[PDB]
């Protein structure tokens, strides 16, 4: 009924704050992005440094894998995204269009498209093959903190400091739904559940919420952690027991029971804000990463 994650590896190498960590869909690799303008690749199971990828002119806020684990896309303060061939290290395309920092990015499941959110308050949809912007959505009235495709790529969910989560039809670009609670503090992260019928959202009032997309109501809420200043990622953990995982501004990784909403674990070891966590696709493994005063990445493993 409770997991028992324990520290297995610490991964040091970035020279500035880490911004994001992501496991490759094939489970072999961890990718990390940093304010040091670099992407680093690490072994998912042993934490062994693999390679560095560079090219952005300013630091990076997000990085994401293609479904086949062969490409990455990165989002940078230099106002661009870059698509990378991981094996060669080549920058395949630079995606230009945003007029301010690019903050978040994701491939669709088919990985022919990329979605991005920016401080310019727009969501953009890009063709992966050509690198051209297919659509610009006037999505929000403040910076866009997260963007995510659902399981079949038909929908996009975006979140923003304007307090809104919005759901977009990928094909038409139409706003299908705006989620509004009783109070609407800045929304700092959002993603669909694996089946696409729920939405997990972080807000800058120390609160994560699980919404029913179709009925448009909040069902579960998770608290006890600290989150008022940074856009901290959140995960569903579903390889063992059903958990919610998030970093926190008190330097800990928080794990909740998805159903009962109780904190089941708090992982100690980081020395600065934990900005990013990821859950391994098949194994009960968590990656965590911390900001400027720490700069390390940690791999934790559990029996359930």
């Amino acid at each position: 009924v409770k997991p028992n994650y324990a520290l297995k590896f610490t991964l040091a190498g970035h020279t500035k704050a880490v911004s994001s960590v992501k496991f490759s869909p094939n489970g072999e690799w961890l990718a990390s992005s940093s304010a040091d303008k670099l992407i680093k690749i690490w072994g998912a199971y042993d934490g062994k440094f693999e390679k560095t990828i560079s090219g952005h002119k300013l630091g990076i806020s997000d990085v994401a894998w293609s479904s086949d684990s062969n490409l990455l896309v990165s989002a940078s303060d230099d106002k661009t995204l870059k698509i990378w061939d991981v094996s060669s290290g080549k920058c395949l395309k630079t995606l230009k269009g945003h007029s301010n920092y690019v903050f978040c990015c994701n491939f669709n499941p088919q990985s022919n498209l990329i979605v991005s959110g920016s401080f310019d308050e727009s969501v953009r949809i890009w063709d992966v093959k050509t690198g051209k912007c297919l659509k610009t959505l006037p999505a929000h009235s403040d910076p866009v903190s997260a963007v995510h495709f659902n399981r079949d790529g038909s929908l996009i969910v975006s979140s923003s400091y304007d307090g809104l989560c919005r759901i977009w039809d990928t094909a038409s670009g139409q706003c299908l739904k705006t989620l509004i609670d009783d109070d609407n503090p800045p929304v700092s992260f959002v993603k669909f559940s694996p089946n696409g019928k729920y939405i997990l959202a972080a807000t800058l009032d120390n609160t994560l919420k699980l919404w029913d997309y179709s009925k448009g109501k909040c069902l579960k809420t998770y608290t006890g952690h600290k989150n008022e200043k940074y856009c901290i990622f959140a995960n569903f953990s579903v390889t063992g027991g059903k958990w919610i995982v998030s970093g926190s501004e008190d330097n800990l990784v928080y794990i909740w029971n998805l159903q009962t909403k109780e904190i089941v674990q708090k992982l100690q070891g980081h020395t600065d804000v934990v900005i990013s966590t990821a859950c391994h696709p098949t194994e009960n493994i968590i990656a965590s990463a911390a900001l400027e005063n720490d700069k390390t990445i940690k791999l934790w493993k559990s029996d359930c």
Binding site: K16, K37, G59, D62, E292
Partner: peptide, 12 residues
């Protein structure tokens, strides 16, 4: 240096 900056790693 001054180029090593990323929005996510700065507070609101």
């Amino acid at each position: 240096d001054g180029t090593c900056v990323a929005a996510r790693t700065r507070p609101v």
